[PDB]
Design a protein around this ligand. Structure first.
Ligand SMILES: O=c1ccn([C@@H]2O[C@H](COP(=O)(O)OP(=O)(O)OP(=O)(O)O)[C@@H](O)[C@H]2O)c(=O)[nH]1
Ligand SMILES: Nc1nc2c(ncn2[C@H]2C[C@H](O)[C@@H](COP(=O)(O)O)O2)c(=O)[nH]1
Ligand SMILES: [Mg+2]
Ligand SMILES: [Zn+2]
Lengths: 542, 74, 145, 1135, 41
DNA sequence: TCAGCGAGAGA
DNA sequence: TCTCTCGCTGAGCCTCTCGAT
RNA sequence: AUCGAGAGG
């Protein structure tokens, strides 16, 4: 049974590689048995002893002596030593990794209505995962008398089955893992809630840990069985415990993308908005004024706010004061927990500011307030990002006028370098390095100039006099946020695309002096294809 | 509270890996044995009743060992 | 029910003791009938019965009769799972060298004996293993050490 | 330019500015020409089949005074046509009859598979495609190791002579500066040995290479190589070479010379092909380019001299990854090679049989046995690495698969053997191989797609068209230039401007010479490109606004366009490239008109055209009958359907589209649907890349698709408990029996839900549909039972009516025994027996049709690399709405536009908004029954917009009915076409938006659906073209609790089909260990699998409510121990 | 082969040694059980 | 195929 | 004592479909 | 169960 003769649909039976090797060894040995009994001449008896040695070589650890035995097709046979070593050996295919029962797999969606310790899974998955529990509790309730009757009730899918399932999955956590388990956070325990559908719903904050997006990515679910497994998942695996990464002190659950987009939009200020220069009782009046439409979200106002501090020994003491803030910051103040300074929200909250705020909340208060604060931050960020109505448009991307000037001067410099190389004073590699340095400097300069133009250029009037302020341009907000994007993407959208790199090294063919706003020509696109090929090859082969 | 986080539950014990106390003895004797829960159930499944008990402070290794010794005598 | 794993070389007597069936002469597998052919790579006497609590000969098929040998074929009745445990042996007319020891490493036989790998390679391939066996038996370890 | 009627109904506006000279050629030509050469009759006998027959024959008979001579060959009429081959399941092949004379009879030499009109073979009822292969050309190649061979760093130059058929041959150096000849990549020997073998003395060898050795200009390498040479006589060198070739190496003089002769200098063993000979002479600089196939000693001396010169520094080393060094082998050449192999195999047996003496009894037919030839041909067509399963998702997928070139396969690189240079692109790929379209897995760089204008030379090297430049004036004649010839000339860029005379307006014009791009004067230019889209392939040319996307996103979009599923109702793309018509026409899914005429009869399954007077033959009736394909499954289980697009009495010209296949709309490629998309965050339901979809899209079935599944029930033959097909099923309900008929087979048209009985449980899992087709095959001789008797009766009754339907219409236009004889043979086919695999009583096939509608978890995408998953089906009252009250269909996240660098979706959104604005204006004008003059005016003003457009559509020629039909087809939005690299600019988009009374910026004020409050900033909304990829959550969902287990290792199987569990690999175990989870790991390693007793005990405990496990030892450790003990090493567990 | 020649012995001290044979790893919640086993000896 | 490492070759 | 040919070891994870032996 | 070929993450 270790080398099975697996049955087949047809008359013929499939045969494993080991059986034929054993058969050949037996054939040669039995040939040696009868031949020596017949007193064959010494010249012939020695020849097939070598063949028997080769057969024993083939049976165990085939291919070491050269000319590995091939069966019907042109594929070397699989020997005993090939069932141990290698990727497909028993060590690394059946002992250090197995195929487990009580598990499933499905696609993942967002479902931003969940709490940090919850995941949503379909009813059709749950009714299959938790079958033995349902059988046992159906027997307990007296609805069924045997296992078969309860089974039939399960296939028929009555209402009692759904009620029992709702009762069963009340507190058993489930383990969710993605396909590449790079680090420890790649598998986590969640409390499950039944949903109607066919896709698993995963908390938005957890995704950054999994490196999990929603571009059709999938996930796998296992269910703990025994009591100790449930406690193990609850105490050490549950997502509320994994707040900080084991590699460094920084936290893992950091708001990103839409959450930050809403948050700094709430916290950013504007000059001469609607309702500026007003005194307010507190954050509640700010929320009422914003929802009623009597004041803008970016108005600069004065709010009487109260803050608790833990500077007293093991105690909280309060202080109230009039502080110059903006309305959106006043609303944002209503979700922070007791015992934190105001200055954590009296500024435009980028990704770094929000992460530092969460770290401070964990350091000062504890863990439960940190979880509550994270959930509130996510909800508020989503809501106000939705109400923001910020969109990307073709008129948003702006191009400066110094770009062509600096490209022309860099072209003059590289032409002078080419003239120098035409003379025998300098070699080829030095010219290559000089040109690449010149073009890198030009790219940095154009990026700086364009980012300056995008950042500064917003002028609004206050009581009839001009003034400058930080821009509300959608692209600049997206870049300054840190939600998604960097300075490289923006500079390639509004400057030079730069210098491309082959899979092995760099190329200095030409400067691609064309944006993605104004289209590339054929030659520039052909040049650019090198970097794309290099990146995909690097990924798939490193 | 207790269903979400067990930080207060582990503060009494001081060792996260010492969940053998909660599971191997308390939850098992509740599930299989005739032992009655101390705190009100609130329709909670087992293994959350025990965690609540350690969180408040009725269950610990010394107390369970002492009780086991009590039922050792006859 | 264990605390350690012990690995060592296998003596021929140990291998002969492992086998539950007599010998492996006939090279056959199956297809004389749907029952497996006697003494074949899939057999009944050697590697146990094929059907649970039922013998190949068909004399008895009851668990109350478990623990009795057969009369027509001589196959004891036992749960078929034992086919995952039993073993057998083949007796070679001429001793054959294990390739793992001679190759795939600094040769163990090539370090027991001073002459290099090529000499042993040409000796084995008749360009015999019995000579190598005699030489390995010839030395005394303590004297040479 | 006058317009065809199919083009006249809907005229797509063009924004192209560059006039086009060369029309897009036939896309599938590369797959049609080669196979033609394999079956055409060539009197010269140079091409495939006749060349192979001429090369193998005649038969010498080994000095026995006998001979075998062949005259010619013919291809017989196939037994079946394509369709019957598809249903019955046999190969669509023709018999090969060859007539021979012995020194006369026809002999059967197997059957040759035939290629259908599209270019796809039928092997076993499944259409297959043989991919062209890109492999290094035969000849001589000089290479270097680049100094990485040794720590010294000295470059080690070498030369290799690769034959089309034969053994390799290498000359290489060592850091000791000595020649070394390698044969068949074996161990090194001094090269002078071979000079000994060629009847050369040492004095002649020293005379050949020398005149006198210096330090830089010459080298005494020959002298040192001869000094190292152990041999001095020819015989010793020959026997040493024999010892190298044969390990046993008996001396056996007068046999070693035979081996050396047959190794290289025998035609039947070694042959350098004509392309190889030409490349050889070109590399070695010989004027003549034809010669002997076998190698010659002069060639060996010359290649050795060239290698010595290259080491000396006189020459230059070649570049391996140059498209002038690689060549394309298509299906015809490979089939010829395989057939020649079979012919050699059979002629061996012919010689063996002719050795014996047979007088007055031997016949030409008797000696030849065709079984090896048939076996070899069948193996090539059905088991090769390049005979791949067809991709039949949509026409674009079929064309892209047919126009593919693979560097893998026999005589090609392996995935591991490929370096990092064969994957990168090369400056010679411009105009021959697309730089964008390529896979993203392990095969990247090793698989490519042919360019749109690419053509193959007669030798096999890719060449591309160019326009000649004469006297500084661009002309209209085109010359096709290959990789080698392109370097010498200078090629201008396709974007250069003209003066309508051919003169270059620019003083300095951009050009590319010798692989580098620079400005050149007007007089120096010698050639110009033909079109701006000459570089990209078809899939990459189907993407609008390609020049604004990142190459990565263009690559992803090109790959995803091939995965779109054909929807329920095709819809044209509002923004396109103009290449849709060519793809749709050349795909072969549509039904094109062979001849002009007037549609005499139109129906849902047939078309009958009355051919015009001047096109009909003198004796022909003068009618054309087209039969359409209705609801037949494809390879990927999708739906293939054809719908007529003409009415009674319409005039028809040549090439007009009669019917639309899947994913087609009036002769255009339509892959998805147009949707109103707004770019904004909406409560985080589109968080990372998710998509929020309204409920109107689900209500209108805009993305509903039909999937057809084939299930087979085969009744095997078993002595005990023999299988049967009968309605009697033990222990079954009354309804399940009632749905089944008397015969036990499901009624056609019935609705079956998962868990029902099709043939007397069989319909699987949750998929449920309607039975649309039931086929039955029974073994010959056994009489049909019950329903199968009625099935063949209906087929036979329809078969008469089917054929008589063409007989009546044919007789309408215009002794009787000529046609009725065909009917009798047609009647026999249904009634006669059928081929089946041995051991089978009968086989019944059932087809199910299921309608899949979008739901959360279904992946959708666009044409610019922007993919996502539907996250919520929002109600209509919740979607953001415009001032006029029209809600949006899709809300997309603006986060993905900056980072994932595709501005193309934004540009397409703006242009689609402009197009739908024009369409809405036309619809508003048409709904009020305004005068036709206003329609003419508005349509002409819309069509005349642009800076300098090449289309120039004039409505004065159009009549009133024509313009009315055009307006009626233009009411849903006027289509717009932007060429790939010469498309619409931003200013033109703004002008078009201003014409339609829409904001220039492209953003409007939106209102919140739930609160009715204005969004604070303007939102970018428009129309964008979306596709539904073939990754549905209906199929990916899976769950297991307890099923069946494997045999050797008692673990659950793997795969959704087998109902198996997921794999808990090494990294997950490391994660569990890092958490310190010791009990979860112990239950996932012992209880959940691989332990026989733990599984049952824990199942019983869980059933009884006790969550306690009693782990044991896994069976995998037991099997490991048993196999190690079997290996001969004692291992045991001590206590 | 080196282990077979040397006649080595394995005490099952590490992680894969227990994972392969299916026991409680000597870390996390199995550390107490391993310590009890060691103290018994 | 590229990239390293240990035992064996002479020089 | 030491610089060089020749051999053997290794080369990420998970999932889905088809055909052909 | 393998081999070959695709595809997704
Ligand atoms: O070969 C591969 C490819 C992909 N992956 C897994 O998929 C991810 C990359 O594939 P994705 O497309 O899912 O991630 P992405 O967000 O970076 O791409 P875009 O949406 O911007 O187009 C990787 O991060 C990895 O988790 C692999 O593990 N191996
Ligand atoms: N899985 C499978 N293997 C088969 C089948 N038929 C033959 N084989 C296996 C058994 C042997 O290993 C081999 C015999 O092939 P032969 O016909 O060239 O292929 C079949 O139908 N299914
Ligand atoms: Mg992803
Ligand atoms: Zn018996």
């Amino acid at each position: 049974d270790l080398r099975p003769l697996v049955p087949l649909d047809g008359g013929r039976f499939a045969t494993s590689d080991l059986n034929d090797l054993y058969r050949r060894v037996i054939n040669r040995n039995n040939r040696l048995k009868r031949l020596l009994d017949l007193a064959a001449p010494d010249i012939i008896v020695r020849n097939e002893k070598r063949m028997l040695q080769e057969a024993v070589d083939a049976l165990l650890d085939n291919g070491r002596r050269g000319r590995a035995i091939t069966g019907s097709n042109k594929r070397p046979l699989k020997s005993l030593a090939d069932m141990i070593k290698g990727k497909q050996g028993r060590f690394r295919q059946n002992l250090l990794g197995k195929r487990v029962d009580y598990s499933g797999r499905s696609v993942i969606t967002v479902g931003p209505y969940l709490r940090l310790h919850q995941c949503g899974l379909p009813k059709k998955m749950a009714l299959e995962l938790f079958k033995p529990f349902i059988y046992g509790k159906l027997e307990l309730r007296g609805l069924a008398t045997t296992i078969k009757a309860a089974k039939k009730m399960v296939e028929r899918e009555e209402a009692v089955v759904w009620d029992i399932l709702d009762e069963v999955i009340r507190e058993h956590p489930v383990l969710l893992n993605r396909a590449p388990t790079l680090h420890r956070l790649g598998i986590q325990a969640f409390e499950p809630v039944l949903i109607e559908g066919k896709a698993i719903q995963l908390h938005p904050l957890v995704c950054a840990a999994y490196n999990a997006d929603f571009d059709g990515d999938q996930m796998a679910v296992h269910v703990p069985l025994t009591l100790e497994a449930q406690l193990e998942a609850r105490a050490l695996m549950m997502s509320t415990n994994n707040i900080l990464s084991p590699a460094n002190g920084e936290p893992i659950i950091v708001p990103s993308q839409d959450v930050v987009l809403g948050l700094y939009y709430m916290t950013r200020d504007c000059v001469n908005a609607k309702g500026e220069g007003m005194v307010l009782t507190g954050p509640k009046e700010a929320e009422r004024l914003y929802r009623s439409g009597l004041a803008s979200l970016h108005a600069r106002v004065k709010v009487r706010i109260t803050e608790y501090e833990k500077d007293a020994n093991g105690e909280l003491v309060a202080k109230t004061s009039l502080k110059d803030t903006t309305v959106g910051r006043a609303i944002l103040w209503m979700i922070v927990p007791k015992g934190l300074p105001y200055s954590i929200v009296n500024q435009a909250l980028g990704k770094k500011a929000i992460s530092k705020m969460l770290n401070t909340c964990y350091r000062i208060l504890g863990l439960k307030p940190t979880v509550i604060f994270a959930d509130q931050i996510m909800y508020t960020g989503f809501a106000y990002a939705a109400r923001s109505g910020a969109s990307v448009g073709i008129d948003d991307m702006v191009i400066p006028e110094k770009k062509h000037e600096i490209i022309s001067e860099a072209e003059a410099e590289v032409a002078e370098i080419q003239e120098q190389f035409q003379s025998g004073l300098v070699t080829a590699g030095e010219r290559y390095n000089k040109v690449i340095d010149i073009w890198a400097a030009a790219n940095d300069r154009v990026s700086k100039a364009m980012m300056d133009n995008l950042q500064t250029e917003t002028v609004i009037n206050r009581d009839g006099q001009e003034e400058k302020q930080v821009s509300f341009n959608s692209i600049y907000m997206m870049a300054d946020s840190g939600a998604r994007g960097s300075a490289a993407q923006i500079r390639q959208l509004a400057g030079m695309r730069g210098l491309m790199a082959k899979p092995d090294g760099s190329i200095i063919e030409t400067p691609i002096t064309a944006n993605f706003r104004e289209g590339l020509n054929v030659l520039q696109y052909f040049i650019s294809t090198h970097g794309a090929r290099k990146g995909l090859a690097d990924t798939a082969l490193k | 509270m207790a269903r979400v986080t067990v930080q207060d539950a582990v503060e009494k014990i001081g060792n996260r890996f010492d969940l053998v106390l909660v599971a191997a003895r308390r939850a098992r004797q509740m599930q299989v044995g005739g032992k009655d829960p101390l705190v009100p159930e609130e329709n909670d499944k087992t293994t959350v009743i025990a965690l609540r008990e350690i969180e408040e402070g009725l269950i610990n290794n010394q107390i369970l060992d002492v009780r086991e010794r009590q039922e050792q005598q006859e | 029910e264990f605390d350690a794993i012990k690995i060592a070389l296998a003596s021929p007597d140990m291998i002969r003791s492992w086998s539950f069936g007599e010998v492996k002469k006939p090279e056959t597998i199956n297809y004389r009938t749907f029952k497996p052919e006697r003494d074949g790579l899939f057999c009944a006497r050697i590697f146990g019965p094929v059907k649970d609590y039922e013998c190949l000969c068909g004399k008895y098929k009851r668990l109350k009769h478990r623990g009795v040998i057969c009369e027509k074929c001589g196959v004891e009745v036992t749960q078929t799972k034992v086919r995952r445990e039993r073993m057998g042996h083949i007796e070679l007319a001429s001793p054959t060298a294990h390739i793992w020891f001679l190759k795939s490493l600094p040769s163990r036989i090539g370090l027991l004996l001073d002459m290099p790998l090529r000499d042993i390679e040409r000796v084995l391939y008749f360009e015999g293993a019995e000579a190598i066996q005699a030489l390995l038996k010839s030395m005394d370890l303590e004297q040479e050490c | 330019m006058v317009y065809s009627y199919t083009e006249k109904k809907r005229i797509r506006k063009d924004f192209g500015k560059r006039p086009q000279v060369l029309d897009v050629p036939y896309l599938l030509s590369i797959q049609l020409d080669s196979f033609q050469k394999f079956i055409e009759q060539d009197p010269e006998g140079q091409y495939g089949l006749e060349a192979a027959f001429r090369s193998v024959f005649p038969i010498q008979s080994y000095s026995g005074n006998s001979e075998l001579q062949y005259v010619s060959y013919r291809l017989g009429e196939p037994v079946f046509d394509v369709q019957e081959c598809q249903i019955r399941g046999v190969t669509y092949s023709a018999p090969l009859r060859v007539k021979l004379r012995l020194v006369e009879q026809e002999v059967y030499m197997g059957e040759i598979p035939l290629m259908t009109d599209n270019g796809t073979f039928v092997i076993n009822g499944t259409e297959r495609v043989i991919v062209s292969q890109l492999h290094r050309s035969p000849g001589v190649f000089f290479d270097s190791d680049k100094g990485k061979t040794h720590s010294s760093g000295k470059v080690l130059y070498n030369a290799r002579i690769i034959p089309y058929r034969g053994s390799w041959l290498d000359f290489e150096f060592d850091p000791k500066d000595n020649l070394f000849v390698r044969i068949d990549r074996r161990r090194k020997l001094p090269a002078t040995i071979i000079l000994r073998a060629l009847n050369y003395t040492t004095e002649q060898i020293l005379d050949l290479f020398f005149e006198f050795t210096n330090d830089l200009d010459h080298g005494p390498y020959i002298s040192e190589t001869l000094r190292v040479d152990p041999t001095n006589d020819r015989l010793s060198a020959l026997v040493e070479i024999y010892r190298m070739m044969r390990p046993g190496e008996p001396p056996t003089r007068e046999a070693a010379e035979s081996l050396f002769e047959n190794l290289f200098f025998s035609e039947d063993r070694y042959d350098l092909s004509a392309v190889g000979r030409m490349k050889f002479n070109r590399s070695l600089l010989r004027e003549e380019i034809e010669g002997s196939g076998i190698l010659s000693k002069d060639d060996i001396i010359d290649v050795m001299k060239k290698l010595i010169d290259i080491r000396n520094g006189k020459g230059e080393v070649d570049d391996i990854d140059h498209l002038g060094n690689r060549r394309i082998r298509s299906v015809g050449e490979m089939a010829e090679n395989q057939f020649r192999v079979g012919l050699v195999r059979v002629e061996r047996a012919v010689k063996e049989r002719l050795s014996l003496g047979d007088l007055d009894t031997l016949m030409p037919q008797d000696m030849i046995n065709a079984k090896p030839i048939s076996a070899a041909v069948k193996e090539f067509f059905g088991s090769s690495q390049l005979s791949q399963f067809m991709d039949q998702n949509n026409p674009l997928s079929e064309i892209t698969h047919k126009r593919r070139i693979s560097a893998l396969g026999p005589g090609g690189l392996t995935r591991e053997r490929a370096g990092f240079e064969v994957r990168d692109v090369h400056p010679t790929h411009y105009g021959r191989v697309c730089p964008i379209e390529t896979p993203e897995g392990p095969n990247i760089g090793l698989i490519n797609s042919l360019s749109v204008y690419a053509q193959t030379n007669e030798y096999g090297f890719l060449e591309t068209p160019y326009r000649k430049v004469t006297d500084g004036v661009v002309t209209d004649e085109i010359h096709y230039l290959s990789a080698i010839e392109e370097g010498n000339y200078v090629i201008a860029q396709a974007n250069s401007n003209l003066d309508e005379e051919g003169h270059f307006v620019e003083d300095l014009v951009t050009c590319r010479s010798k692989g580098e791009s620079s400005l050149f004067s007007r007089d120096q230019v010698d050639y110009m490109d033909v079109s701006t889209q000459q570089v990209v392939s078809v899939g990459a040319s189907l993407i609008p606004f390609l020049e604004h996307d990142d190459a990565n996103r263009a690559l992803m979009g090109a790959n995803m366009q091939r995965q779109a599923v054909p929807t329920l109702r095709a819809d044209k793309p509002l923004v396109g490239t103009g290449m849709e018509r060519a793809v749709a026409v050349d795909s072969g899914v549509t039904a094109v008109a062979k001849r002009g005429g007037v549609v005499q009869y139109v129906d849902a399954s047939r078309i009958v055209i009355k051919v015009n007077e001047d096109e009909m033959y003198p004796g022909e009736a003068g009618i054309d009958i087209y039969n359409l394909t209705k609801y037949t499954r494809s390879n990927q289980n999708t739906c293939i359907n054809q719908m007529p697009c003409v009415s009674l009495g319409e005039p028809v010209e040549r090439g007009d589209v009669l019917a639309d296949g899947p994913s087609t709309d009036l002769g255009e490629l339509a892959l998805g649907q147009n949707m109103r998309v707004a770019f904004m965050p909406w409560n985080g339901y589109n968080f990372e890349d998710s998509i929020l979809v309204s409920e109107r899209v689900v209500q209108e079935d805009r993305f509903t698709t039909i999937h057809i599944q084939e299930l087979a029930c085969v009744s095997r033959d078993t002595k005990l408990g023999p299988e049967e097909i009968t309605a009697d099923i033990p222990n079954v309900g009354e309804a399940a029996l009632s749905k089944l008929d008397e015969s036990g087979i499901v009624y056609i048209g019935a609705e079956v839900t998962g868990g029902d009985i099709l043939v007397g449980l069989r319909v699987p899992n949750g998929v449920s549909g309607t039975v649309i087709d039931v086929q039955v095959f029974t073994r010959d001789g056994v009489e049909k039972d019950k329903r199968a008797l009625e099935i063949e009766e209906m087929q036979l009754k329809q078969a008469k009516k089917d054929l008589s339907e063409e007989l009546q219409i044919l007789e309408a236009g215009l002794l009787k025994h000529e046609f009725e004889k065909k009917l009798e043979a047609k009647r026999r086919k249904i009634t006669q027996g059928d081929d089946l695999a041995p051991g089978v009583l009968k086989i019944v096939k059932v087809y199910l049709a299921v309608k899949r509608r979008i739901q959360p978890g279904d992946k959708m995408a666009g044409r610019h690399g922007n993919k996502g998953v539907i996250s919520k089906i929002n109600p209509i009252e919740d979607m953001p709405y415009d001032e006029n009250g029209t809600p949006v269909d899709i809300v997309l996240n603006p986060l993905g536009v900056p980072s994932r660098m595709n501005i193309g979706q934004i540009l397409e959104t703006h242009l689609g908004m402009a197009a739908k604005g024009i369409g809405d204006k036309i619809n508003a004008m048409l709904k009020q029954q305004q005068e036709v003059a206003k329609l003419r005016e508005f349509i002409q003003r819309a069509y005349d917009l642009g800076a300098d457009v090449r289309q120039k559509v004039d409505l004065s020629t159009f009549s009133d009915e024509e313009v009315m039909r055009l307006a009626e087809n233009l009411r849903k939005g006027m289509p717009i076409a932007t060429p790939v690299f010469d498309g619409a600019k931003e200013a033109e988009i703004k002008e078009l938006l201003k014409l339609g009374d829409l904001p220039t910026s492209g953003q409007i004020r939106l209102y919140d659906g739930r609160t009715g409050e204005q969004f604070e900033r303007p939102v970018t909304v428009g129309y964008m073209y979306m596709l539904k990829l073939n990754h549905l959550v209906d199929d990916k969902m899976h769950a297991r609790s307890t099923g069946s287990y494997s045999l050797v290792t008692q673990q659950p199987l793997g795969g959704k089909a087998q109902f198996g569990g997921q794999r808990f690999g090494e990294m997950e175990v490391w994660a569990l260990e890092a958490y310190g989870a010791a009990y979860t790991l112990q239950e996932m390693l012992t209880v959940k699998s691989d332990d026989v007793n733990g599984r049952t005990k824990m199942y019983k405990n869980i059933v009884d409510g006790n969550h306690q496990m009693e782990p044991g030892m896994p069976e995998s450790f037991n099997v490991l121990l048993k196999e190690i003990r079997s290996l001969g090493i004692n291992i045991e567990l001590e206590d | 082969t080196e282990a077979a020649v040397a006649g080595k012995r394995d005490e099952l001290r590490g992680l894969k040694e227990n994972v392969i044979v299916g026991r409680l790893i000597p870390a996390g919640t199995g550390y107490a059980y391993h310590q009890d086993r060691m103290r018994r000896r």
